[PDB]
Design a binder for these strands. Structure first.
Ligand code: ZN
Length: 50
RNA sequence: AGGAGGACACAAACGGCGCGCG
DNA sequence: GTCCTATCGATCTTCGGAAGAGATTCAGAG
DNA sequence: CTCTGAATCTCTTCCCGCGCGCCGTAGGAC
């Protein structure tokens, strides 16, 4: 759930390299910001550091 | 006649309680 | 049945630790 | 009247692995 303790756009996406909203599923769109959910697509590991 | 035209990737978790062994 | 909110917001959470160390109070003490 | 004594307060601590095995949100409102 967004804006929660596990918000995707706050801490990071859950999928390996895919955004939560599913707009992008490739390294070709790595680093871009989606506007279907607001989550930033990057390496999911960053989710443990933000 | 002549002549003309014509989908890749991907293998199980975190805290108690109890027991037991070194 | 589902999904909810809230968590002794009318109790009594255990009495079979020891100690060791500070920290905090008190007590004649001038 | 506080000072510099004790005395009485709370807090911290307690070997290493290893296996079994269970056991693990709750009551209330639409
Ligand atoms: Zn997305």
């Amino acid at each position: 759930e967004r804006d929660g303790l596990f918000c995707a756009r706050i801490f990071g996406p859950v999928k390996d390299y895919e955004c939560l909203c599913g707009k992008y599923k490739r390294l070709k769109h790595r680093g871009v910001i989606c506007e279907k959910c607001g989550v930033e697509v990057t390496q999911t590991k960053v989710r443990r550091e933000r």
